[PDB]
Amino acid sequence: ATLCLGHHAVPNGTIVKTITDDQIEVTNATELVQSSSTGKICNNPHRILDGRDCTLIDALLGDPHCDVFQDETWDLYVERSSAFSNCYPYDVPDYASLRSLVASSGTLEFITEGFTWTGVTQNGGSNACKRGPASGFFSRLNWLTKSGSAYPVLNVTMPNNDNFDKLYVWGVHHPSTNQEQTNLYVQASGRVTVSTRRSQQTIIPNIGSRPWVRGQSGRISIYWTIVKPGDVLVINSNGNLIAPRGYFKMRTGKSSIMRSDAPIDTCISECITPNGSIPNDKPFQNVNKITYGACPKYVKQSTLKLATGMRNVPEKQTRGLFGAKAGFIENGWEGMIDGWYGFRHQNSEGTGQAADLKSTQAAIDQINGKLNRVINEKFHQIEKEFSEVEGRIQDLEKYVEDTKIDLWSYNAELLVALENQHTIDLTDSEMNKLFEKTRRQLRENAEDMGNGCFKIYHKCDNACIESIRNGTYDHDIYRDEALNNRFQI
Amino acid sequence: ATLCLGHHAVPNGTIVKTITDDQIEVTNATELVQSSSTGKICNNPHRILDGRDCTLIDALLGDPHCDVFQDETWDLYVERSSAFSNCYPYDVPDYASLRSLVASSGTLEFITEGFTWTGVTQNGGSNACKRGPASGFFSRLNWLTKSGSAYPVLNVTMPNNDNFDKLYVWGVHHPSTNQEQTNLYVQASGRVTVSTRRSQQTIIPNIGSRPWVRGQSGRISIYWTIVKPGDVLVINSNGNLIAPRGYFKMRTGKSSIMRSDAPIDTCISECITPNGSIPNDKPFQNVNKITYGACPKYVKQSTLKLATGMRNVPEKQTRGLFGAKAGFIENGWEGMIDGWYGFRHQNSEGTGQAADLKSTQAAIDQINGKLNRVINEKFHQIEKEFSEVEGRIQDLEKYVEDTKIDLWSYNAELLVALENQHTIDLTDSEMNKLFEKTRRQLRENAEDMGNGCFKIYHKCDNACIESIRNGTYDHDIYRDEALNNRFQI
């Protein structure tokens, strides 16, 4: 009787990359990198706000082309490339910081305060900001103008007796010509200073012809002030003031902003990318470096295969004529579909096959436990794509982003290589232990033929083979016959 | 007959560093850190432009001391420590951003435009910019001055009808005294506003006595504006305007800048460092953290050895008298020069040595494969060395670079240790596998003497030893003699 120990093999198999060999054929493998997106943004479980044709700053100021975004909350504000401004031309010095502040706040909650403007005409407007059939202005700003023929120096105050920060968004008007600074504001040169007990901002405006935009050659520079509890806002203006109508509530949370043209459809997904929502089961993704929510780490590799099975050594008709097969170290067994390791016997009663459940289950559980560890929640990050050229800060952000990508890609490559090598080693070790256990079970009743098979020198039926398989093999009831047939011709 | 299995050793071997011990001897190792440079910069395949005695901004503005750099293109601009300015004393607000912008553009290509400045005197100059025997100015700037006794409000425009971004470099002149201001620009205070449809820049010149530089106590503040296609540039000047004569073409590419004093010699190299060009075969380098082109990663470690061979255990005359030495368990073999593993036999016909080529080839292939994996293209990065003291952003850049260096050094240490340990454990495994194969071949006809040797209990000639070596050893034609000599005294 002969008992051969072998492992399974699949007809077709995957190719993985280990420490030494860059192409190792294994039975099964899994993809560790996500490179596909549905192209749509789910609205669960996060609050997604489609900005349509309005920027976050445009909704902050009160663009009349969209007042729907008034007093709204969001977890991710989605900016579309078709957005535009349809009001008085304006600019925001340090624009990105204000955008980040409003995005991270997450609430466009405007509360009006009782500002008193003595001696000036309120509710100014322009033909570039038509609110229907008449001339209007930003909803959250107040354009002050000379009342009668005098513009007094305005000195207004407002305390913060509450328990939250207040964001005051104000502005300074830069007229096109000196006829204007005088017609609107009497004084030839204005000045706007907004101060708190710890900081101040003073703006001396400008006179000059800017390019024609929506019929106005002037500009409006938008500034913001943060008032902490126990502080007081003081506004002193000689002229050229676009006063605030109130304050925006400021809160700290997980809110952020994103630029994408992807549609929004009803579904559930915890990871949002500009290309669309992607599943987060895989530890790595290769869709976009801009992510929101629980998202996989971005890598430069399109594919990365983790070895789930063992090495694949199939039958290729290399050797062995008319059957005549061998144990584990000749090839694998494509005919074993019950387990990873098994026995094949040829006794006087015939041939047969069986599977070893203990070693197969041990290998499977070890590989599954390794897989579980292999498979972060980032909400507000730095901007990663830029449409203009700025300089030092942009290069710094690009350098940081590239360094992070390179380090994470190296980590992913090293991790997958190490795991694949250890998987192969653990499978080979498991087969070695099975062979050793069979050898100690058989003792001097069998001999190793060098091809992964034991030649048993005593005749015993299928009950004997089952006893060897299950470990309940008594070598002392066969020692005399085995020794006689082994050492005495 | 005795057959012994052994592995080769070298008289002097390297000392490498693995997980277990920091000092373990290995027959052959390779250095993984490039710590030396040739001291010169190659001009291929990258287009290197030696700046000589001018900074990039000086060539941008057109200092008379090197109009050679007009309409120039580079892949890497080399800035020398001997660079100096020889024109009107000028300052560049936020100098680094403009320097990086021009360096990444890669071209000093100037296209003149038909600006019409009616009512002012053009082509102004100063004695600090001597263009030979006469007084000149920057070639790419136009110093406007009152014509007669009036300086009108200059309101000029220029659109973007092309498909590329235009870079307009202009300036504002801060005079030394009010007398000179009124003599040059009539108005007591000047005002320069340069605007596009989405941005603007206003400058109010201030008058003061700056330190005497090249005969003039005034200053020129240089500003830049980027005009995208479909945009227009409008310049409105009450006075104190250094007008632009045209625009610089803006390009996106792989150009950068570097500060180095190294010479440039005719050679080829894909990696450039301030200390010179270095080879890019090694994965790590310890020359400089500033690199251009395909360059190895900078690491803090001066040396890093990767084990190419296996443990080196030589003879040291400890045990074994009168040449009676044998086995791989005890030590290695210096007398083996044709293979890594092999056999030594002592039979009735004498002694002999041979090498087992299959295991040696397998080990060499595995080691070469793991070497190929160990063996990036960065062009424009952040500044790494600073000569001034600025603050926040400088510490931010230094922190980023330090973190990157530390992470990459840790990665290099871990990689070297892991690869060395795996190499040692795979060579030992190969030796053990060869021993196991020999034992399986020698079924019941030989026994292991523990020292790594097989005593064969039957006589056979050199053909028998060759048959054992090549795998074609039939144990059935020797069982009777071996058993008689082994088990029956």
């Epitope: 007809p11 005549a324 000749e330 091809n451 | -």
Partner: antibody, heavy 90, light 93 residues
Framework: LRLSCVG??????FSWVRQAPRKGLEWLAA??????????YYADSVKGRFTISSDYTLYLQMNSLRTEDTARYYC????????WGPGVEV | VLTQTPLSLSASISCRSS???????????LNWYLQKPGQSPQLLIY???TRASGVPDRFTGSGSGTDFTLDVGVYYC?????????FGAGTKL
């Protein structure tokens, strides 16, 4: 005589096949590998009165040949005739 | 013994065996070879299901037990489960 039966080592099994000009392929001989005692089998027609072959890849002659063995001989590799050679006319 | 039908073709070739060529391992012991005019026979299909690497995908064959089914040349079906292995008559296409 032999031919180029490669296009490595001797770990594989081998076979000798005969093709008459217009009679089709006929398997004659097969030599196993070392791992299975190199048990060699021969065709029932060539049986006994055969001409054995080996490797070091050629076949001998001067035997019970009855002028019927005039054909093209092919050296094949594997348990099955997987890799073939140009063959030699006889 | 193996019977190959049709003997002449003008795209399926059938090889039927008296004894089933399925082994206890679980693989059918049949190969399909192509002999081009004047050149050496080339492996097309091994184990009656698997396709040899490096051959055009135009060729596909399948079957079990006794029945197996499948460019100018002769097609041969070969068995290697019994002591006297042999090829078939050959289908000329």
């Amino acid at each position: 005589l032999r031919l180029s039966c490669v296009g490595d080592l001797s770990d594989y099994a081998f076979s000798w096949v005969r093709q008459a000009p217009r009679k089709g392929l006929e398997w004659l001989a097969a030599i196993d590998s070392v791992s299975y005692r190199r048990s060699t089998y021969y065709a029932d027609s060539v049986k006994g009165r055969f001409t054995i072959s080996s490797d070091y890849t050629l076949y001998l002659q001067m035997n019970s040949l009855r002028t019927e063995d005039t054909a093209r001989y092919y050296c094949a590799r594997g348990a099955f005739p997987n890799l073939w050679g140009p063959g030699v006319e006889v | 013994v193996l019977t190959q039908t049709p003997l002449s073709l003008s795209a399926s070739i059938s090889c039927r065996s008296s004894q089933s060529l399925r082994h206890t391992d679980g693989k059918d012991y049949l190969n399909w070879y192509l002999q081009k005019p004047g050149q050496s026979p080339q492996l097309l299909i091994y184990y009656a299901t698997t396709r040899a690497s490096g051959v055009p995908d135009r060729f596909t064959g399948s079957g079990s037990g006794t029945d197996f089914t499948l460019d100018v040349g002769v097609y041969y079906c070969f068995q290697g489960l019994q002591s006297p292995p042999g090829f078939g008559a050959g289908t000329k296409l």
